[model samples]
Target: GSLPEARLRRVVGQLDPQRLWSTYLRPLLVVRTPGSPGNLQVRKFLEATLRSLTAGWHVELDPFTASTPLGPVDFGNVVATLDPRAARHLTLACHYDSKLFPPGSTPFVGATDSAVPCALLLELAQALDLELSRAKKQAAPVTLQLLFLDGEEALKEWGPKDSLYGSRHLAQLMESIPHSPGPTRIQAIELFMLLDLLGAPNPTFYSHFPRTVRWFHRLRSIEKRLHRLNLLQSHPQEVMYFQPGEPFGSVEDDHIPFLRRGVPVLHLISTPFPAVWHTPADTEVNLHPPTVHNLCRILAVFLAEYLGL
Candidate 1:
């Protein structure tokens, strides 16, 4: 048997994990409860970047009538669409409103829970735009859309009914889009990959969707692609996995509405929770490069396959 040779790292398709860690992940902050201003800060940061993304993408803010004295009394979602000419199908998402706990309390940085994933997708848009230029009207396999939703976190406990108001509202709107009638309009979606809590040193991913045999198989391919290229470690125990049969608690995060809508979904997340979760210590200092890199790699592989780029 011959030894496998190392392949060149194709990070051109991936993001600079360290850059994400230092620039995006390291900023310890998010929407805390009781105060509406914490949520404002997160939306402000996103708005600044959303303008840059609009040059090559069709950008808009999707506003929803928020019933609340919760400060963001009327909430609006940030949405950007890249390569919309290809089709009506979309990759939807949302990062929750940041926690608004009072100052001197636990670090309410929601970086791991969201900001990192939001940054990852932004980077993906950048890489793909570069590729589209090179490909030049060569028929992009799938169009891409980005949705940065508001109001994902709950003021109190995250109940099935209350936690994901934004996602539910968005899904309802998306569901309505098709009723207007157009052949290119998509009533059945190809895929929706939702990234959450992905900036930890090592992450544990749970694969879902009974109709997602192809998606699950794609994960194996990505793992192999990284491993064979010497981009992944040799340690068998570096990251752990538990079968769906096990009793580990499952999360009721943002993926619920899409799942209910019959859109096959990929819920990328870390369970057992992290130490810095919801704490003031969840600052940028706690973020690591390895986790950022891993997430970027997995997403790059999937997008490559999905768009057949």
Candidate 2:
């Protein structure tokens, strides 16, 4: 939020909602449940998109099989980083799987559940590519990493082991791989901001953890500042996306594994949730482009300020 007005608009200008939707969001608006054909397709899209986008990205896929209520399923988590050699990482992440409904249920696309968040991450990386590369050479050593985790939805019902398959597995794997000269991979995380259930209009969120309230306030202020600067499109309702409040209990999400391990987390998700959450009606048409664009601009500044660009 401390960035100059000229720089702020430049960063905000880099993220176009039309381009964000067509280039990134469009492909992900599918029933990409883990282990399904659509899942594999979307995963490939994320990996390939990152690889082709910029020279700054060092992409790696963490693939494994896990047991679930429906039996064994294959999963892969896409870990894309700007500078793999950095000691600390500032992370942005989201789940890629749509909810698995019963056999006779209507097809669920999960547009807000996570599809838009996935697109937003891509837009973030692309918009910040130049700034991130320069920051790696000039600023603090903390790097930027984007994670597209698989198998976040439960196979049958929500339970400890039934959901968050990819995050739980990856969190443990990070701990196992020691940095050799210093801390393990898990300890390298400076912050983990998980985005989900977004894209609908007039989203409302709250600070959900005491240790991370400062980061939450950072976002709240960015949204406020963007509006005051007249950089963001007007919303139908007069409301702040990031509300003012004390940290409260968080809903179970892909962040649980990292949060429990003492990682500072800011969960940027809708509180009351999108009206079409987990339902077949959660499709692309229901998403509001102005809201998506505003969120993107707010985050562009957030990333720039955090990286000291």
Candidate 3:
């Protein structure tokens, strides 16, 4: 059975589980300060990694100029793309920046907050690139961009405007795309999916409000697949809640920007933090491999079906 305790662990071991946790995943938690050395350094790593995916994968450092008391913070939104020939469209994104709290204060590690999704997404990018090569598939008809958002952390005020800085900037940038080529770059999007804080033990994905219909459709399909594979036995306590208009969950996240812009989004997240959210304890040590692997497979299958590739 796919969800047997041992089978679950083995499936998660598909990737270098220990290496991913210790190396790529852990390093992402090292600093990742927005516009800081940690953040910028990760950009370099992203560039190198993307370069290996395909000869054409280029790192786009879109500049978002904004003012702050500390002069101006040139938030560089790092983007990596595959198949430029693909149409401009929805993105699968996760923020790579970790919030800064105070000096000597153990700020957020953001292991489940993002880093894993970013890493897993990158892994998918590699696999997709390979499949494209082998099948001689044309570039994706709808461009699939991986956005490593800069500031999803509520670094300043509690107001919605202050939070999701990078997301707000991206939306504004897109809105100004009156004449840009809609294929490679467009103002409107087909959809947007943001994966944040998901690594957890038996994380329950209860479809939230606003996107209840879509979420349930997808969840039902995925849950059926899990049941067919007999994985439901392993997650007996995991609740597959019905999205019948009742609010399942509510929390601010990177999905807010796209949602406000009339672009419907599916937020993939699990902030099962019991006092650990936005804390240093959200480290790689706590990142669960099964969660990562589960989301990865579900995403891979879901996207493949969506893209019809």
Candidate 4:
């Protein structure tokens, strides 16, 4: 609620629904399996876009190999940091790769599945830049890292060998590779906020981490306040439901590797699943702009508070 009007307008406006369509979703609709032409295209686009947003900051391709049914395949995770010099980081992750559909199936764009989540992260990078500029002479509490992971979707089946290839590799790499000349390790990451199944209207999110439940409420509160201020047309309906027991289930996603290593996680994915999930109908035409806009503003407010901006 303390977010400045000009800053909110500037940052939230950058998530223009039209731009998200023309710039990202359309260009990334192809089957983005690792080693495919579309996968290469999306990776290059993300690198270039993030580089432009985080000028003078650290951006790199965290490369690794994955074992698929076809054998060993190469994949790279795109990482961009707000402060590269800082060892401790708050990571926001999303998988850019679409699921490899069965032969003869209709094209799958995975608009809400993750294309929107990736776009949301890119928008947040720009918004965070504005917050950093406004906080001139003051330092943020921690570094913010954007991880656009590759090979998140199962290449064949949802098994140990087929799923979460990028995150598992990166998590292992962080442990093995120590920081230069210091005890500060890249594994010093504080939190991981994984996003998925966004851009659909009336999405309901359930929290997966009990420790991160407070953060979930914070975002919900911000949405309510924004609606009162007329900044949002409708209330963001996400609720806290971290019931990892009977009648409630959790998801196996890109965050599992980091979570297993004791890193705190906030898994922001829609519950009950979107109708268009894993289908040809999951395209830009089905994405709801108001829902996307409200979610973006909620995140902007959350980031402002998180960074003490």
Candidate 5:
């Protein structure tokens, strides 16, 4: 009775693309390479925004100095929790750092690559703020956490030792955080749902991990139901997932570290990546508003189901 489909649509529809650009991405374009002036500014902005949204919940900053091939680099990951006391939780994460630009490269605003994903997570927190607060009153069955990661982009070249610095650190740190009055285990995360490359038009996400494929289809089903209810505007003509045994290559993003340490992960990255992928063309001007809104609607439904809202 609590999760009304129409109300879910209305809440998700509150994701405004213009507001995403104006409030988050507009100033975020300032070259957030690790240890740069821009990086410091963006982290502060992220902390302030998250604190504002999760007013009564928990917010933590995991700052670490990563020893890298390039030398020691400082990075911080922001974690905001809907229910801090819940020993088990669902993690929704995205990398916030933009790529390092060369002298003659495009401006590298990184709207599609990851900027929009962060904005989507922020919008979701705000949209579900009322529900999240209400659920805590009744000992909610599920807890939600959002991770804004840093240093996902390799410093100079993409290599095993260079990329995924933030996630690698966090995954290891999750092991040591003691869980009391509950089952003490190696992993605290139940499901790690990672979102990336999210703003381009005509996006299609494939279910790559075998263990999480059922949850993948569940999300697709929710999208279909929303479309039938006339709530979603963008619908794909072809099936969303890849053909069985199809050789869509794998990526090594922030999810790898957690997945390696035995976490059930749902990687929601669009395959054959966006055309503007790593170029100056990947700006807010190139993002399709409807695609972003439709994705938020689909995820809102999925979260409602997962958290038993």
Candidate 6:
């Protein structure tokens, strides 16, 4: 169901792009590899931001050292939940680590590769904090969760075992754990929406999974409605951000392990990827604020409806 225009105004109006840039993008747009100092700094910034939000999130760090093709490397995944005790949840996820660069290679900040997605999630959480509380007060059952995964990029190669170290491990760990109300943590996840390769100009997303197609429909409609209402700041203004056609091809990403465990997936990565992906040019200079803000609002509306706010 679509929210009333007045209510939608309140939800999207709360977005502050400057705050998104200062707090999230600045800290996250760094050369963060698994267990590197940049990675630690990025994690701290995320944890602190969640603690500061009135949403009162329960933050958990799943830190582990795994042997990659390159050697033994440390990786961690941050799990922050709005209602830690809820038996059912809607999860939003993004990988925080940048592509691995050699010792002297020009730094790869990965602003579009994922830094923008992380900022988008944080901005959504910030914009909807009070509304989320209102839903909680009204006894909303399903909760919201965020996963900042590490080690998404392969160290030396793009083989199965070399990539997605954090997601594979965490999915296994969650499957073995217990949540109250009688289901294992793995089974509790109602949806896993993964974001990747965003922040660049002129990007389009498509629906891939049949199980989550309806949710993707909601996202597409929200973007269209907002565009129709002139609520979004878009270039070539009438361009549809979420395509209605079938995806050209599938990509391997952090959502794979969870999808394998019977969890439904909604992957929000751009098609063909941003031209700057994995290149030294993938920095803040290449990000488009208008597109960033537009995506932020689309996701905010999607989440607001998902949580019944």
Model 5 lDDT tens row, 1-309: 235766676666666656666776666666787777788888888788878874376888889998876688899988888787776788899998888777786667688768888887877777677778788777676688899899999888898988888888888887666664433322667899999998788877878798998788788777667766777665654333223343388888999989987899989988879999888888878988888877877787777778875
Which stretches of candidate 4 lie above 4 Å from their native place?
A: 1-15, 133-139, 180-186, 234-247
Instruction: Find the candidate with the highest lDDT and give its number.
Output: 6
lDDT accuracy of residue 73 in candidate 5 = 84
TM for every model, in the order presented, reads 0.81, 0.95, 0.81, 0.88, 0.91, 0.97
Write model 3 residue lDDT over 167-221, tens digit each, in one string.
7787777666553355214343566777777665566554554653575566556
In the predicted model 4, the residue pairs found to clash are none
- Please, what is the whole-model Cα lDDT of each candidate in the order they appear? 0.60, 0.86, 0.63, 0.76, 0.78, 0.88
- Which tens-of-lDDT digit does each residue in 141-191 have in candidate 2? 788889999999988889898999999988888878886233788878899
Task: Report model 6's TM-score to 2 decimal places.
Answer: 0.97
What local lDDT score does residue 92 receive in model 2, on the 0 to 100 scale?
Answer: 94
Q: What lDDT does model 4 reach?
A: 0.76
lDDT of model 4, residue 24: 59
Look at candidate 4 and tell me the lDDT of residue 97: 88
The alpha-carbon lDDT assigned to residue 150 of candidate 3 equals 83
C-alpha-based local distance difference test score of model 2: 0.86
For model 1, what is the error of residue 160's alpha carbon versus the real structure, in angstroms, after optimal superposition?
A: 3.5
> Lowest lDDT 10-mer window, candidate 2?
231-240
**lDDT preference between candidates 4 and 6, better one:** 6
Q: In model 2, which residue pairs have backbone atoms overlapping below 3 Å? A: none
